[PDB]
């Protein structure tokens, strides 16, 4: 069955509620649900469900001209009234979408006609079209599939306009997708897709080698990186490694001792041998990161000065700040307090564990005692929320979230980035400037605000950037070259040709 493929994912795709988050899998939601505008690697958005659009001179009112030939998979039509209902179902659950600023921006959505949709905004929101293009929540399910005329409490059938339809879902075993034969756009060459539920990275690698699955598509945690490096040399397999898509990094808690001292955060940024870490743990498959965002990120080419590996400077910074070595000890003290920092991470993640040891060892050389706290997933998420960490592993989100969306969510208390920065003296000014840069339409001021925000975060050493990571692909040669989706969390199944 060449026109059919089998792949794998750690968990099930979920109920596929377009307006909700976990356990829903973003790649799966983007397979079924579609946006008004499609994000492109160009950095632009192109028409999709909305074939064109105008906006008022103050950029507060937007009128979208939708297509008239788009049906939901069940047969029901997609029109401006359906769109409006979806935005209403979403905005009735507005508080949960606080991370995403557009959900706080939309004042009204109404169908002017069957093909005219009007959206009104609190202000001129620059990232409007980008956040309309996101996998969630602003995508469309058939209003019939609502429950009590809402979606926040669940849906019935995941009926979308996209080129794929969920056909079967047996928990902890598999999910089966089929091609929407009445898809309005172009037909995918593949008809059937099977997602084997395989929670363990090694077990996924083993699954591929035995030929049980035909494709693996994910980030640097897709499969063991030593195994991936081996696959790349195996002429029976095909592998890929995209341009970098996002930053992997440490978040330093500016509100908790001793990471509340700028000198300490600065010294930590000088302490890690990143190239060694990347050669050792990442098997040279990623790039070294010096800044929160790579220079290639929009508005992020600022000429920020890198803090490169310099143990001697790291020591002198600590020495100067009052962190000295007691007699016969390797760990520094100050005011009776030892230089001890808690690095918490998911304990069943071999990569994080492997990255944590190196960091612990590197920072021990500069007189810092790092305590590896490996906990389960839920615990680490809880620490991130409540800001109960010294150091923590963190990720940026890639296009099109970087930089505006990642920056925007720094204002949300529930997020690790707010907690990490909570000890900053300029945290209100930063948060104020983040709100401004989203709503300003002066391009000179926008770049000026982005510079000031990123520079401050850089100059305050809030983060310890480690690497810029890439997308990884492992596939049977028969599938050919596998394209990359413009959005890091999407998997372009509709582009693959067996
Ligand atoms: C579990 S989703 C969610 C719901 C409410 C508040 C926060 C979140 C999770 N994240 C923000 C939302 N999240 C989008 C989403 O999950 O639809 C950001 C995000 C972006 C790209 C890949 C991933 C991801 O979680 C925080 C994070 O991922 O660090
Ligand atoms: Fe998320």
What the chain holds in terms of domains, given with CATH numbers, is 1-242+471-498 (3.40.190.10), 243-470 (3.10.105.10)
Query: What kind of experiment solved this structure?
Result: X-ray
Other beta carbons less than 10 A from residue 379's beta carbon = 15
Q: Does residue 150 have a cis peptide bond before it, meaning omega lies within 30 degrees of 0?
A: no
The residues, any chain, with a CB within 8 Å of residue 342's CB and separated by 6 or more, are: 370, 371, 373, 389, 390, 391
Identify whether the C-beta of residue 484 lies closer than 8 Å to the C-beta of residue 492. yes
- SS3 state of residue 190: coil
Distance CA 70, CA 76 (A): 9
CA-to-CA separations, 158 to 18, 135, 173, 216, 285, in angstroms, rounded: 8, 14, 19, 25, 37
Eight-state DSSP code of residue 48: S
Instruction: Name, in order, each residue with C-beta under 8 angstroms of 29's C-beta and a sequence gap of 6 or more.
Output: 16, 18, 135, 136, 139
Provide Rg for the chain, Cα atoms: 24
Phi, psi of 119 (to 5 degrees): -120, 125
Is the dihedral angle over the CA atoms 268, 261, 419, 374 positive or is it negative? Answer: positive
Closest ligand 1 atom to Cα of 398: 21
Tokens of 36: 């008004």
CA of 230 to the centre of ligand 2 (A): 31
Please, is 300 exposed, middle or buried when counting C-beta atoms within 10 Å of its C-beta (0-12, 13-18, 19+)?
Answer: middle
SS3 96: helix
Output the six-digit token pair for 135: 């996998």
Is there a contact between 351 and 467 (Cβ–Cβ < 8 Å)?
Answer: no
Q: What is the 3-state secondary structure (H, E, C) of 432-465?
A: HHHHHHHHCCCHHHHHHHHHHHHHHHHHCCCEEE
Chain centroid offset of residue 438 CA: 19
Ramachandran bin of 74, using left for φ above 0, alpha for ψ from -120 to 50, beta for the remaining angles: alpha
Q: Are strands 192-197 and 369-375 parallel, antiparallel or unpaired?
A: unpaired
Ligand 1 atom closest to Cα of 394? Answer: 29
- How many Cβ atoms from other residues are within 10 Å of residue 206's Cβ? 14
Alpha carbon of 389 to ligand 1 centroid (Å): 19
CA angle 465–469–472, rounded 5-degree value? 165
Residue 163 CA, distance from chain mean position: 23
How far is the centre of ligand 2, averaged over its atoms, from the C-alpha of 397 (Å)?
9
Residue nearest (by alpha carbon) to ligand 1 atom 18: 397
Residue 287 three-state SS? strand
Contact 161, 140 (CB under 8 A): yes
If you write DSSP's letter for every residue of 350-414 in order, what string do you get? HHHHHHHHHHHHHHHTTT-EEEEEEE-HHHHHHHHHHT--SEEEEE---TTTTTHHHHHGGG-TT
CA distances from 216 to 211, 231, 472, 476 (A): 12, 12, 8, 9
Nearest CA to ligand 1 atom 24: 397
Q: Which residues of 217-236 are buried (b: 16+ CB within 10 A; e: fewer)?
A: bbbbbbbbbebbeebbeeee
Taking Cα atoms as reference points, which of 85, 106, 83, 88 lies closest to residue 37? 83
Contact present, 102 and 120 (Cβ < 8 Å): no
- The Å distance, Cα 401 to ligand 1 centre, comes to 10
Query: Closest-lying ligand to the alpha carbon of 26?
Result: 1
CB-ligand 1 contact for 161 (6 Å cutoff):
no
Instruction: Supply the angle between the helices 311-321 and 262-271 in degrees, to the nearest 10.
Output: 160
**Contact between residue 306 and residue 405 where contact means Cβ atoms under 8 Å apart:** no
Ligand 1 centroid vs 315 CA: distance in angstroms?
37
Q: Are 21 and 136 in contact (CB under 8 A)?
A: yes
Please compute, for residue 113, the number of CA atoms within 13 A of its CA located in the half-sphere on the CB side: 8
> How far away, in angstroms, is 312 Cα from ligand 2 center?
39
| Burial profile 333-345: b = 16 or more Cβ within 10 angstroms, e = fewer | bbeeeebebbbbb
Instruction: Indicate if ligand 1 lies below 6 Å from the C-beta of 397.
Output: yes
29, 47, 30: which is closest to 38 by C-alpha?
47
3-class DSSP assignment, residue 74: coil
In this structure, what token pair is assigned to residue 333? 């003290």
Secondary structure tally for the chain: helices H, strands E: 14, 21
Strands 4-9 and 192-197: parallel
Pocket test for ligand 1, best of 21, 249, 417, 420 (most atoms within 8 A of CB): 21
Mutate to test the pocket of ligand 1, among 19, 23, 26 (most ligand atoms within 8 A of CB): 26
Q: Are 147 and 85 in contact (CB under 8 A)?
A: no
Query: How would you classify residue 75: left for phi > 0, otherwise alpha for psi between -120 and 50, otherwise beta?
Result: left
Distance 411 CA to ligand 1 centre (A): 14
């Amino acid at each position: 069955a060449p026109d059919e493929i089998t792949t794998a994912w750690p968990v099930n795709v979920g109920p596929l509620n377009p307006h909700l988050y976990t356990p829903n899998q973003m790649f799966a939601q983007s397979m079924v649900y579609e946006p008004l505008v499609k994000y492109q690697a160009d950095g632009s958005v192109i028409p999709w469900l909305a074939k064109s659009w105008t906006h008022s001179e103050d950029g507060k009112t937007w009128t979208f001209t939708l297509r008239d030939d788009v049906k939901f998979s069940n047969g029901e039509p997609f029109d401006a009234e359906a769109a409006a209902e979806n935005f209403r179902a979403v905005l009735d659950n507005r508080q949960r979408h606080a991370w995403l600023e557009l959900a706080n921006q939309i004042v009204d959505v109404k169908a002017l006609s069957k093909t005219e949709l009007q959206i009104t905004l609190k202000s001129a929101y620059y990232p409007f079209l980008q956040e309309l293009a996101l996998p969630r929540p602003f995508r469309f399910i058939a209003p019939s599939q609502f429950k009590n005329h809402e979606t926040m409490n669940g849906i019935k059938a995941p009926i979308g306009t996209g080129p794929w339809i969920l056909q079967e879902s047996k928990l902890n075993q598999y999910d089966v997708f089929v091609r929407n034969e009445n898809y309005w756009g172009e037909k995918p060459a593949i008809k059937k897709i099977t997602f084997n539920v395989i929670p363990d990275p090694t077990t996924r690698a083993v699954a591929f080698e035995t030929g049980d699955i035909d494709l693996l598509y994910g980030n640097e945690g897709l499969l063991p990186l030593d195994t991936f490096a081996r696959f790349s040399q195996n002429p029976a397999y095909h592998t890929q490694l995209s341009q970098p898509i996002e930053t992997v990094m440490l978040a330093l808690n500016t509100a908790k001792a001793p990471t509340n001292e700028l000198a300490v955060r600065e010294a930590l940024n000088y302490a890690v041998n990143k190239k060694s870490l990347i050669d050792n743990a990442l098997y040279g498959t990623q790039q070294v990161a010096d800044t929160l965002f790579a220079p290639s990120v929009p508005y992020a080419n600022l000429g920020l000065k890198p803090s490169q590996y310099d143990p001697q400077k790291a020591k002198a910074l600590l020495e100067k700040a009052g962190w000295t070595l007691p007699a016969g000890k390797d760990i520094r003290e100050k005011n009776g307090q030892p230089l001890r920092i808690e690095l918490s991470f998911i304990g069943t993640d071999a990569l994080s564990k492997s990255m944590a040891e190196i960091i612990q060892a590197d920072m021990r050389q500069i007189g810092a005692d790092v305590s590896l706290i490996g906990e389960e997933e839920s615990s680490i998420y809880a620490r991130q929320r409540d800001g109960r960490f010294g150091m923590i592993f963190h990720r940026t989100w890639g296009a099109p979230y970087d930089p505006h969306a990642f920056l925007s969510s720094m204002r949300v208390p529930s997020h690790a980035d707010f907690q990490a920065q909570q000890g900053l003296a300029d945290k209100p000014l930063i948060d104020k400037e983040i709100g401004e840069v989203l709503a300003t339409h002066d391009e000179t001021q926008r770049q000026a605000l982005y510079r000031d925000i990123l520079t401050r975060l850089h100059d305050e050493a809030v983060y310890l950037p480690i690497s810029y990571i890439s997308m990884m692909v492992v596939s049977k040669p028969e599938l050919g070259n596998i394209p990359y989706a413009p959005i890091a969390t999407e998997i372009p199944f509709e582009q693959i040709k067996p």
